[PDB]
Amino acid sequence: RAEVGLVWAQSTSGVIGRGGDIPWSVPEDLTRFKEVTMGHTVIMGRRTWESLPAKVRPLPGRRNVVVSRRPDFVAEGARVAGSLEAALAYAGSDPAPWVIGGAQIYLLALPHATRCEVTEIEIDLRRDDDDALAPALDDSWVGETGEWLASRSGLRYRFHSYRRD
Numbered sequence: 001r002a003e004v005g006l007v008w009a010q011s012t013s014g015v016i017g018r019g020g021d022i023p024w025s026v027p028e029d030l031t032r033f034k035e036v037t038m039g040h041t042v043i044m045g046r047r048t049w050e051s052l053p054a055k056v057r058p059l060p061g062r063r064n065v066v067v068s069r070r071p072d073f074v075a076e077g078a079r080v081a082g083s084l085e086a087a088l089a090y091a092g093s094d095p096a097p098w099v100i101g102g103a104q105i106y107l108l109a110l111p112h113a114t115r116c117e118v119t120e121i122e123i124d125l126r127r128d129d130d131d132a133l134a135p136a137l138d139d140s141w142v143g144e145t146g147e148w149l150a151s152r153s154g155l156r157y158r159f160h161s162y163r164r165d
């Protein structure tokens with residue numbers, strides 16, 4: 001088995017996206033994200049692809065895979081996959097492909113997943129109807145939660161690192 005991983009950043013309340021963007025500034029999260037995903041396949045939903053600045057995509061040093069129901073969708077510098085099953089196939093021999101968002105794609109991949117790396121951001125965001133939300137993890141997941149750390153931005157964050165099987 002490839003060890004299928006999910007990686008995301010959420011507010012304590014579970015928001016991951018608002019108005020198409022990440023609704024906070026925590027540089028340290030992007031560092032952790034890169035440190036987690038470098039050298040691996042990164043699988044993402046079409047909307048997440050379009051949320052990435054055009055100048056920042058595809059993510060360098062990683063095989064980019066975009067999931068869309070449209071067989072003719074084009075993602076320059078990425079492979080387009082018609083299902084999470086097809087995306088995982090494209091990861092080939094990668095021992096640890098990572099699913100990197102967003103909300104709909106996390107729900108799709110969750111049944112396949114054996115690792116989650118979650119950054120929690122201490123910011124008071126009240127869930128709105130149009131927010132993208134993190135999936136809820138049940139207690140079949142085990143691992144560790146680090147201490148709260150001060151970001152350069154003045155917010156606190158911490159890492160959660162879970163596995164199952």
Ligand SMILES: NC(=O)C1=CN([C@@H]2O[C@H](COP(=O)(O)OP(=O)(O)OC[C@H]3O[C@@H](n4cnc5c(N)ncnc54)[C@H](OP(=O)(O)O)[C@@H]3O)[C@@H](O)[C@H]2O)C=CC1
Nearest residue numbers: 008009016017020045046047048068069101102103104105
């Ligand atoms: N805080 C964080 O860690 C992160 C936050 N984000 C945020 O999350 C938000 C995006 O999340 P979300 O809106 O849910 O969108 P997603 O990024 O999950 O992509 C949704 C798209 O995936 C495709 N898709 C969904 N299900 C299937 C399926 N079963 N088979 C084939 N294709 C499928 C569809 O594309 P199509 O319509 O083209 O067919 C759909 O529109 C953005 O705001 C982004 O900024 C993103 C990544 C990380």
Ligand SMILES: COc1cc(Cc2cnc(N)nc2N)cc(OC)c1OC
Nearest residue numbers: 007008009022029030033051100101119
């Ligand atoms: C490298 O920059 C981005 C990375 C991500 C995805 C992402 C970001 N952080 C974490 N912890 N997990 C993720 N999947 C999402 C982004 O925007 C939606 C990014 O652009 C700022």
